[PDB]
Every structure is written in structure tokens, then in C-alpha cells.
Amino acid sequence: VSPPPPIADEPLTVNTGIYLIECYSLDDKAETFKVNAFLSLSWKDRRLAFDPVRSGVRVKTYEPEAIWIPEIRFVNVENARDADVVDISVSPDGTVQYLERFSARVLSPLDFRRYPFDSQTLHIYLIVRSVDTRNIVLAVDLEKVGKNDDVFLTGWDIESFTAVVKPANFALEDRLESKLDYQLRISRQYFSYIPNIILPMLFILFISWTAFWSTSYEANVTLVVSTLIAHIAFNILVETNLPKTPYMTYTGAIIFMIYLFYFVAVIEVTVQHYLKVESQPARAASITRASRIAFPVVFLLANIILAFLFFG
Amino acid sequence: VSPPPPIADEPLTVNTGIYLIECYSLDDKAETFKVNAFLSLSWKDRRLAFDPVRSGVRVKTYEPEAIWIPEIRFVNVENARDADVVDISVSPDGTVQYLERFSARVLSPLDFRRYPFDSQTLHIYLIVRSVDTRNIVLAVDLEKVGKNDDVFLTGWDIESFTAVVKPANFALEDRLESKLDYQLRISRQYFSYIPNIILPMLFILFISWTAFWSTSYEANVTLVVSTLIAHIAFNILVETNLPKTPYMTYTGAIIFMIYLFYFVAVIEVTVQHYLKVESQPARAASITRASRIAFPVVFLLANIILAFLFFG
Amino acid sequence: VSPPPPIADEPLTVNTGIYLIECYSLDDKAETFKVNAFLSLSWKDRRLAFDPVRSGVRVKTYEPEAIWIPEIRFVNVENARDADVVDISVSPDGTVQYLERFSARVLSPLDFRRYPFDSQTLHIYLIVRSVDTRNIVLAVDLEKVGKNDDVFLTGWDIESFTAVVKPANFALEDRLESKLDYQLRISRQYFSYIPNIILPMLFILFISWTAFWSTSYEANVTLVVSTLIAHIAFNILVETNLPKTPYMTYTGAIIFMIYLFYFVAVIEVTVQHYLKVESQPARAASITRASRIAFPVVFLLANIILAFLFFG
Amino acid sequence: VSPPPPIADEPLTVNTGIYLIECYSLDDKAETFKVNAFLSLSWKDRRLAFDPVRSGVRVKTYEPEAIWIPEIRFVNVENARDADVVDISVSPDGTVQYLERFSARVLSPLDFRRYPFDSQTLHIYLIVRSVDTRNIVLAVDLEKVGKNDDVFLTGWDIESFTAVVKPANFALEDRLESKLDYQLRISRQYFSYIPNIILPMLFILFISWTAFWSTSYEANVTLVVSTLIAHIAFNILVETNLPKTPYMTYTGAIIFMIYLFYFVAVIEVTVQHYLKVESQPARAASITRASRIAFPVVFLLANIILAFLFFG
Amino acid sequence: VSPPPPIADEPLTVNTGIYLIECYSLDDKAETFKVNAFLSLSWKDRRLAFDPVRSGVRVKTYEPEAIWIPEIRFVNVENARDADVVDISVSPDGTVQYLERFSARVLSPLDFRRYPFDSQTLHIYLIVRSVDTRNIVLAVDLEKVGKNDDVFLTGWDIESFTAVVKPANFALEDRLESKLDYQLRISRQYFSYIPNIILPMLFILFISWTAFWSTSYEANVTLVVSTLIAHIAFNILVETNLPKTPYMTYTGAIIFMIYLFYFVAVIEVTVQHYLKVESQPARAASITRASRIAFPVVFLLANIILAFLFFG
């Protein structure tokens, strides 16, 4: 119920450690994700060291109350974690052992500049206040950090789960503080995004382009306009995707380029028909023959330039 | 335990300051948002002066029980805040330092009259419970008011976070109760809205307008009606994100004007065809030539007038 | 604590009053509806006044576990309300003043007929638990009943807020009549709904009607059928901002009438083309010239009749 | 706080009853519905004895935690009910008048074979356990079962609310239990479903059929294909209805029939055009004339057969 | 209160059994499902005994709090289960029976690689908190396991519910802890999927394929492009009821193949028209005649190959 007293001036060190169990429900628009894991703490307290020979036992057990557990809080959580203690043990020399299970929802920003092929890093922070006149510092136990082989996040791949051993210390509300950082690195599985999204747009665009090999005005108008309507519907079907961003991403630029191409195609069809009506078939034929080759080459060049810009 | 007597015959002033940590879940339908922040208080009570040199200068850590803590309640909260005491400290002169941490849901109105380019303001209200013997008033501490640099809202950029005073006896209640006000000014990042919404709408409108350079009735009818269908689909896509509001905004006026323009274009096409059939081609040609320049100028003038009306 | 003892067989009257704050969160399909508001009691406590003296004329402020607080329950709440007392003032004489802030999910019937121009009435029912002493009666307190002039019920303008003691009985008791009924009459602001829904529908219908000034079968077919498709898409858009109503409605009647008009227009166009093919141009011209005038007049007459029928 | 001392070897019995207040949120996706109601129980215990000799009283309330109460639990519920004791009393002979209000969400299967015109039955199950050596069985008090005139469910009609007097004892987990059954019979209101769903589809089908009075191939193709697209869009709009079911429903069969009719119409139009091209106009005219009368008759016969098959 | 003495050679063995009552709310995006079932335990403790002699008529005894209870914790469960003790019984010889009732949420992987015709498996994991003095391992009781006949899942049928023993020393910790696996095998009822999904899409494709029996370019382009739009709308309808799957499934392959077929059909129509324009009708006729037979055969072959690749 009382913090240990310092011998001369030394602070107290607490050894932490987090062991993941499962990550799920990674919301894109809300920029949150849920998690449940094991939390382990250990600290040394000489005031409760007992006699092993006299008592005949090596390690004594206890109960969650009536003993000094340091407070540990999470910075970026919407609500306090739901907790239940699993074990408390005391070593002969005084060091304490602890274990608990918790579940919480974390807040972390995301970067969507390369949304189909992006990589993200999620941060978890642990913080402890300088209680009483004893300074409290945090340490990382490298043997108590890990994850289960059954930890699966849908559509994501897990690369590493480490902790920055060196903490960050500063003064907040006229009191010293220490903050620990846990980093989880993930990479998106982009294979499914190709056949379900990318290729149908190309097919519809080529269907639009196929109108340069024709002369009838009504057929060309029907083709181009119905293809544009189909593109709008596909954009509606795709909109279940990244939220509004302060920057320009890859997919947004591609979609805008597609809209521009549709507008230019409509302009070309109108120009060709207007020239044909004015009894100048040669100019219309030259224009359509030029456009036949001009359109795909410009599309490929613009796509290459965009890929250079966003990945170079 | 007991209220501090007014031996000095002075009002019991406090020093209140809120330090933010992060804000999240700014709902539009329910007109509310969540918060997670500290709360620091400081008041003078000479009943527990601690001049002697018993223990260090930080003569402190009285438990939350067996001590008089002024009770502070929020006003515009859906549910009572959750509280957890962090520090309780006493200076030898007589002032007592106190701190907490809380999470709550705050209700505050929003005004989407300029939805793409609007700025909002969020209010937090503070009230102290009076005491029969003495009097309590509020005050703000400039140093203790601030926010972390890690605060973020999805789509909003924070500008300022200040505190102002509001005189007492709010509403019909007049039990000498003073209240405080906290304002968080925010803006909306409106860059991404341009290439996502505005430009495709103009492209579709221009595609529809291209019908004035033709004389085929069937092609013109197909162009105009199919572009109207595309306009309706894009309206569905736009409304998917825009929160519902029971009043008139900027985007609603723009959409209504677009519908009106489509109706007028259909009327013009019908008039041109009917005049042409009656063996009066000169009048039809003159009408379409006039409309070619009439439509964009009127559209630009209407947009300018609307912009001046809503933003001035 | 204990309830006040009988004095001269005088029943205990409780003057109640609700001070509205917020009316928001219209959840589900217009069945559940959240309320945040204050709540005021005033029951005399004669022959038990605490420290009554002119030397102690200062207003007495007490704690909830210090005086007898009557128990009041809401009849139609999904779950028991979350009580939160703001402050308690006890006069030296035999009277008390109570004020608390609550939040509950209230269930009330909503009628959506006359959906754009409807008025709603919300009822909340109050009963008070009886004790072994004399019967506790309920009465209205006119002074404390009212709003704060700044209720954030968006889209609705509040007309009045009154209360009546309606005699009722549910299961079994001598009186059981101690029930209060507070009614909050509200009305909807329908101005935005006109340009949001009504006018585009008429524009589309007129665009469909433009086919009577033509003689091209292909043009008429394209016009009418594509306009029908646009009408279906606009209906899909309209159904989003509207709850599920399992009963007839003004808007539903209008939509059905529009569908019938489209069907009749298709029939007329087919008949005209068939006659023209069978070489009866005079009959075809007479039919179309009659329809040009017949359609809008019947539309207006049906609309007038429907409005008169639905709106008394 | 112990079970009653058995005055004999007879099994202790408890008679109960449920009084409904409101039924709402009859979800069909998860086959659930919410409800709140009064629960009334009564038993006998010689531990409590009144004092008619000591001038008597008539109510003499108590508090729930002070007396033994049998544990009543519901079988098919989401979680434990939210029960707050409203009134508990006693009598000179020693009968306890228990009355609590509870809210819960119930699980019950639904049958959707006649979805537009279907009637269902909902079940609530009560259960008790054999405590100590004293066996406990349940009884039904017909005076405490019923619903008030204010019980309304949106879009449904209430028929009856009864309880089977005879329980169904069984041995589970080496113990004997008794179960009570409460049934609530409801019937759907179907009038609003006709002009909202049934008739527009018939109008679209007739618009598709009107293509047998023409000879132009392009107009027929446009009519049939655009009507098919409109039917698909209407199905998209209507899809907010009954979920996936193991069996086959009425509306699903009707929709499949409509799809078959559309396919047959396309085949007929193509065959007629192919015959017309091949310089055999007489056969094409005969086929069209036959189909004109063959389509509606087959549609009517199929509808009659389906009606006899499902509702007969 | 105290752990059992380690007298026997074998560690303490508990007999666990789960009796399902019902399951519900199977969410697929988060891959969770809630449960409601029993929990029956048993073990032998020789510390206390009840001799049949000396008024040993009482075979069974009840200890609410004055007895040692092994505690069971769930692993793949989002929040701690809500359990309430039902009954505790003690045999005269020493064997102790124990029962509860719980309800919680479960996290389990899902595999939608055969979405219409897939079978899943739901897991529940149980662990025991080791005691210092003695040792505990789990065991299964086949007569304490099972499910009630009133269990139901909307769209599934239950095959079996069995249990097995998982190896000790799970995860990184090796503190002689054992785990229990409860297997629930279900299958998806797919009868309603055929006439709701598969047949309409085939009908639309067959309608589109009729363009090979015509020579009119306008009719061909109208048919193909409008059927493409209809396919996109039907894809929206199909996806509406499908949870998001960030991988490649059977239905996605089918849809992509349909898109490819539409693109090839457009190319063929364009080639036929272009060849006909240059006065080479024999080659165009040969091409269309070949395509008439080529398309269905290739479609069937691709379908067979996909079926063998995914279900073999």
C-alpha cells in the first residue's frame, strides 16, 4: 500500500512485456484497431522478502489487493483496458512477478499515399507517473515480447513486433514521466485488388476506345456514354475504400485520368462528326487514324509517369 | 471532510486547466464527439498548513478520501464522465494541487451551411457545486491549458484551444453558480473534394452541352438523357458521404441548379427539332447558335451569384 | 433516512418539473429516441426541517445519502435512467429543492403520414413508488417546466412543453393514478424538402412528357424508357433518407401515381405508332394533340384530390 | 435468505404471469425481437408473519435483498434481463406480491413461406431449478397475463397472448427442471406491400410486352433490354426484405418467373427479326400475332398455379 | 478455499462438459459469433466427507463460498464470459460436482474459398489456472457434452459437436498447462443461391450472346453494352450480401471470367462490322458463324477447369 523508500537516490525500475494474442477489426476510416494480449510486469521490493529455509517455501503467492502494484496506463486508447489478474508471486530476495490479460481499442494514424500497395506501422504507448517521492522508470524484457503463430489480421501480413528499449522522458503537469513505444509493422495483401478492381476498368476503357474504328454517329455516342455510365457505377462500387485525405493518392489520380480520357474521347467524336457533315471526309479520316494510335500510347506514358511519381 | 472556513473572508478561487490528449469520433448525425484529456485544479486551504520540516518539501499524498475536494461537473455530456485520481499534492503555504483523467462524450451543434469550406467550433462547459458556508468561483490558468501535438481528427486540422469566462446564473437557475467555457476551433481540409466531386460534375455537364453542335435528334436525345442518368448516379455517390441536414446548403443549391439546366437543355432540343420539322431551318439554326454561348455564360453568372450570396 | 411522518393526515404532494436540454439521437426506424434533460422536484418536509434558525439562514446544501429522496420511475424507458444529481438546496423552512440531469432512451409512437408536413407529439410517463406511510400524490410545477431556448433538435421547431396528470391504471393499487404525462409538440421544417425532392421529380416527368411534340418512334421510345430508368434511380436515392414505414404515405401515393402515368404514356405512344403504321394519320394526330392537353390537367386534378383526401 | 422451511413433504410451487407493455424492433435478419414487460410472482413462506393482533397494517412493504426470492431465468434470451424491483409486499397470511419490470431481446425462428401474407408465433420460455431437497414447480396465474390497449408493433397485428398451463418436466445435467411456454401470435399487414412492390413490376412487365405491336428491330431491342435493366434496379431497391432461407418463398418464385419471361421475350424478338431478314415475312407476322395473345394467358395461368401451390 | 493435498500419484483431474443451448449472430467481417451454453465440472477432493452414519441421511451438501473451486478461463474470447453459479453438490465419498451458465463472444478464423458450397469449423479453447501445491489437468465427459435441439443458425446446419485434448505447454510459456478444443462443424445451405444468383446471370449472358445472329451494328452495340451495365448492377446486388474477402475466391473468378467474355464479344462485334464495311462479307460471315459455336464451348470448358481447380 506504500511505495518502497529509496536507499540514497536511486529510482525504481519496472520490467514490462506484451505478448499479442489476436488483432482484428482494423477500421480504415476510423483509424483504429482492436487487440487482446498478455501484460507482464516485474519489480523489486525488499520490504517483502521472506525466509525460505524458515518458512520451508521458495515462492509465496498473494492476491491482487493489499499489495503495491504500480499503475500502468495506455495513452492512445478510447477507453481504459478491461483487466483481470492471473498471478502474483514473490521471490525470496523480494522481486515481484505479475501477469494479466487485457483488451482495448487503439488509436493510430495511417498513410494512404500508396493505398493498394501500402505499408503501415501501429504504435502502442505505455506510461507511468512519478508516484510519491520515488521516481519510476520503465524497462523492456526482451524475453516477454512476442506474438502467437495464430495471430491473423484479415488481408494483412505481420512483419515484426518490437519495442523501443530506450523510453522518452519529460515533465508533464509538473511531474516527471516515462513513455514506452511498441511498434507493429504490417503490409497489405494486394493480390486480390488486381482482378476485382484494376482489370475491369481497363476492359471498360478499351470498350470505350473501340469506337475509333467506326463511322456511324449514334453507335459511337451510345458506346462512349454507356461506357462512362458503367465507369461511374464501378466507382460507386469501389467507393467502399480509403477515406478523405489531405493528399492525393494513387487511385484518385488514376480515376481522374480516366475521367479526363473519357472527356477527350467525347470531344474527338464530336469533332469528327462535325467535320464529316461539312463535306471534308479527308480531315475526319486523318483525325480518326491519328487518334487510333495516339490514345493508347498517351495512356501508357501517363501511367508510367504516375508510377514513377508515386514510387520513386 | 468539511468545507474550508472563510477566515480570510475571501472567495475560494480555483485554477482550472484542461490538457487534451486526443479527440476522435466526430459524429455528424448525433451532433457529438468524444474526448480524452486531463484536468488540473488548484485552490487555497490554510486549514492544513505544513510549515515544519517533517518530510520533504512535497508534503502531499493525502488520499482522495478524508479531504475536501470541490466537485466539478460537465454540462453538455451524454453520460457522466469517468474519473480516476492521479495526484494529490499540498504546498506548505496552503494551496492544494489536484489532477485527474477522464473520457466523455460532448454534445455541441454544427452548421453545414458551407459544407466543403466550413469551419466549426466545439464547446465544453464547466460548473462547480456551491457550498453552504463559503463561495467558490472559477478561474483559468494560462500555463495549464494546452493540447498535445498528437491530436488528430479524420479530415480536420486543429487551430486553437482557448478558455473564456461566462457570467453566472445561467437559464432560470440562480443559485450563484458560475460556469466556464472551452472552445476548440477546427477547419476542414477541402483540397480532396475538388478532384473527387467538382471536376467530374463539370465534365459531365460539358459532355451534355456538346449536343448543340449537332442536328440529329436521336443522338441529341440519347446524349442529354444518358447524361442526366449519369448525373443522378453521381448525386447518389455524393450524397453517400454528405451528412443529412434538414436545411439548404451550398451543394444542394448547386445540384438543384444543375437539374434546372438539364431541363432547359431538353426544352431547347425539343424546340429546335419542332422548328426544323415545320420547314423553318433558319430560326432553328439561330436559336442553337444563340444557345451555344448563352448556356455557359448564364451558368457562370449563376455560380458567381450563389458564391457571393452564401459567402457574404 | 426515513420518509417524513404524517402530521395531520395531509398527503405528501410532490411538485415535479422537467427542464429540457437536448432532444437528439433518433435511432432505429423512428421508434427509439434519446433525451438529455434536467429534472426538478420540490416536496415539503415540514416538522423535519434541518437547523432552522435566522443565524443559520444560509441555504443548506446536502448529499444524496443525507435526506429522503423519493423514487420515481419512467414507464416507457428501455433501461433504467442514469441518475446524476447536480445540487441539493434545503431551505430552513419545510421545503426542499432538487435538480438532476439524466439521459435515457425513450420509446414513443411516430406517425409518418403527411411525412413532409407532419407534427409529432412525444410522451413521457412518470410514476412514484408508494411507501408504508400515506399515499404520495403527484402535481405539476409550472414555474420549473420549460426548455432552455437552445434545444438541438435539428429539423424540428418546438411548439410547446406542457404537463397533465392523466388518470390511469396498469396492474393493481388503490390509487395507481399518480401518473404524469409530458407532451412535447414539435413540427418539421419542410422548406428544404421541396427543392431536395419534389422539383426534380416534376422536371423528370416533364422531360418524359416532351415526347408528345414528336413523331419519331425511336426517339419517343428512348425518351420515355430512359426517363423511367432515371425515375427508378431517383426513387432509390430518395428512399435512403426515410425510415421504414409499413403503411401508406403521401409520398408513396405520389410515387405510385407517377408510375401509373408512365405506363399510360407508353400505351399512348404505342397506340399512336400503330395507327400511323396502319395509315390513319388524322386519328394519330388527333390522339396526340388531345393527349398534349389531357395529361397535365389530369395530373393536377389527381394531385389536388390526393392532397384534399390526405390532409383532411 | 434461505428457501422456505418445508411444513410438509409437498413440493413448493410458484405461480407467475407476464404483462406486456410494448413490442418493438422485430428484426427478421437475426430472427429476434425486443420487449419489455411486468413480471409478477407469488409464493408462500411461514418465515414471514404479519401482526393483526398489533393493530395491523395493509401494505408493509419490504426490500428485495432482505428476503429469499426464487431464481427465475429465461431460456432463449440474449443475456440476463434488466430487472429492477418496483413493488414487493406481504399480507397477513404471508403471500408475497412481487412485481418487477424487465427488458430483454428474444430469439425465435420465423417462417417466410408466404412472406407478404404470413403469420408467425413467438415463444418465451421460463425455467426454474430444483434447489436443495425441496422440489419446485411452476404454475400459471391467468389473472396476471395479458397486454394493454397500447401494445402496438409497427406493421403487425396482435392476435393473442396465452400461456400453456401444463409444463414439460425433463432431466438435464442430473437434475429435474420445469419449463413454461408463452406464445404471442401475430399477423402481418399486407395492404401497403401491393402498391409499393407488386404493381410497379407488373407495369414494367407490360411495358416490356408492348413490343409485340411493332416491327422495328432497334426499338424492340431497346424496349426489352432497358425494361430488363429497370427490373434489375427495382430488385436492387426491393432487396431490403426477407433474408436467405433454406426453402423457397412466394416472391422469389414470382421474380424467377419474371426473369424467365424476359428471356423468352428476347428469344422471340430475335427469332422474328431473323425470319424477317430471310424473306419469310408471313411466318414472322403469324408468330408475332400468336405471341400477342399467348404471353398474357400463360402469365395468368402460371400465377394461378403458383397461388394454388403455395396458399392451397 | 485451500488447494487439494497432493496425496495420490496422479494429479487432480477435472471433467469438463459443455451443453449448447443456442448460437446466434454469426458476423463474418469480424469473424465472430456469440454463444449461450452450460458448463459442468467435476473433481474428487478427500479433505471433506459426509458419512452415511450418525444421521447421514443427507447425501448431498452445498458450499457457496466455503469451498475451493478451480477456475476456468477462455482464450479466444473477446470479453470475459458472464457466468453465474447454478448449483454445487458434494458426494458423501468426496467427488464434487459443479455447474454454471455463461454467454460470451468467440473469435474464430473463417475460409470463404468455396463461398456458396463451403463448410466451416468453430473452435472454443479452455485453460486451467495451475495451483501451487497440486497439479491439475483437464478431461472430457462425453455424457456432459451435447446441444439442445432448439439450436439454430440462419443459413447453416450443424453436423456435430465434439471435444478433444490439445497438447500441454501452449505458446511460449511451458508451465505445465493444458488446453481443450471444442469442435463445431457446420455447413452452408445453398439451395436458395442457385435461383437467386446463378440463373439470372446466365440468362443475361445468353441474352448478350444473341448478337451473333444479327447484322445491324446499332442493335449489336446496344445489346452488348446494355447487358454489360446490367451485369454490373447485378454484381452490386450480389456483393451487397457478401462479406468482404481480401483474397481470391470462386465467385470472384467467375465474375472476372464473365468480364473477359464481355470484352471479347465487343471485340468480335467490332471486327465483324469493320470487315463488312470494306466489302469482304464472306470473311465476316465465317467469323460470326465460327463464334456462334466457339463461345459456349469455351465457356463450358473454362467453368469445368475452374470447378476442378477449386474443388480438387
Side-chain angles (χ1 to χ4, degrees), chain B residues 135-147:
Chain B
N135 201 331
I136 321 89
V137 312
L138 278 315
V140 316
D141 194 2
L142 260 299
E143 161 68 341
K144 302 321 211 63
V145 177
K147 49 177 202 82

Side-chain angles (χ1 to χ4, degrees), chain C residues 194-221:
Chain C
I194 292 172
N196 275 327
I197 298 169
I198 290 299
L199 282 190
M201 257 313 189
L202 295 207
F203 287 162
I204 295 169
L205 193 56
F206 301 162
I207 285 179
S208 159
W209 281 344
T210 64
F212 297 134
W213 281 261
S214 168
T215 39
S216 194
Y217 185 53
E218 291 80 16
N220 302 354
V221 159

Side-chain angles (χ1 to χ4, degrees), chain B residues 228-243:
Chain B
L228 173 66
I229 298 180
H231 167 47
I232 293 186
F234 213 90
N235 183 17
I236 282 181
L237 179 71
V238 152
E239 165 151 348
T240 291
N241 183 329
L242 172 44

Side-chain angles (χ1 to χ4, degrees), chain D residues 241-260:
Chain D
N241 64 47
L242 61 83
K244 292 291 181 183
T245 60
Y247 33 71
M248 181 97 100
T249 86
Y250 185 53
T251 36
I254 287 191
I255 293 176
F256 188 69
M257 266 194 18
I258 287 185
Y259 277 114
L260 216 52

Side-chain angles (χ1 to χ4, degrees), chain A residues 141-154:
Chain A
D141 183 298
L142 286 314
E143 306 299 334
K144 305 302 206 316
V145 179
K147 62 181 177 296
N148 261 17
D149 313 328
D150 302 359
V151 176
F152 69 99
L153 248 179
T154 207

Side-chain angles (χ1 to χ4, degrees), chain E residues 65-219:
Chain E
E65 304 169 341
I67 219 161
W68 177 81
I69 301 168
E71 52 282 337
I72 293 320
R73 225 142 268 291
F74 285 6
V75 173
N76 59 326
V77 161
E78 187 169 338
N79 315 67
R81 72 187 195 281
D82 314 328
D84 35 17
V85 186
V86 169
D87 180 311
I88 300 180
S89 301
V90 167
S91 69
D93 312 331
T95 80
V96 183
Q97 273 79 2
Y98 187 126
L99 198 138
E100 271 156 302
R101 172 139 187 255
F102 73 75
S103 175
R105 304 176 56 178
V106 187
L107 306 169
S108 65
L110 276 77
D111 167 278
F112 297 122
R113 255 80 167 171
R114 315 159 200 219
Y115 161 66
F117 325 100
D118 57 344
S119 300
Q120 320 286 16
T121 300
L122 303 202
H123 293 90
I124 303 180
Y125 292 117
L126 275 73
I127 64 171
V128 52
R129 292 182 49 185
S130 297
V131 82
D132 40 0
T133 64
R134 212 171 171 182
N135 202 333
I136 309 178
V137 294
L138 305 309
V140 298
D141 186 291
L142 265 307
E143 296 86 47
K144 295 299 186 61
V145 83
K147 62 178 184 301
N148 242 29
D149 55 352
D150 293 4
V151 298
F152 66 95
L153 265 178
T154 308
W156 307 85
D157 56 350
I158 291 95
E159 285 189 352
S160 67
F161 182 65
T162 57
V164 284
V165 170
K166 299 312 286 295
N169 291 9
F170 82 131
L172 287 178
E173 295 79 15
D174 42 352
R175 281 81 190 177
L176 211 51
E177 75 288 2
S178 185
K179 196 165 62 178
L180 275 180
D181 190 318
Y182 277 90
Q183 303 264 340
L184 180 46
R185 285 176 262 290
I186 55 184
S187 199
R188 177 189 293 284
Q189 334 171 254
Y190 60 88
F191 173 79
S192 72
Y193 276 97
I194 287 203
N196 284 347
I197 307 300
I198 277 143
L199 287 178
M201 203 93 91
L202 290 191
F203 287 166
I204 299 168
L205 197 72
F206 298 166
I207 283 178
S208 161
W209 277 349
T210 59
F212 308 134
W213 274 271
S214 172
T215 43
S216 186
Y217 189 54
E218 291 79 12

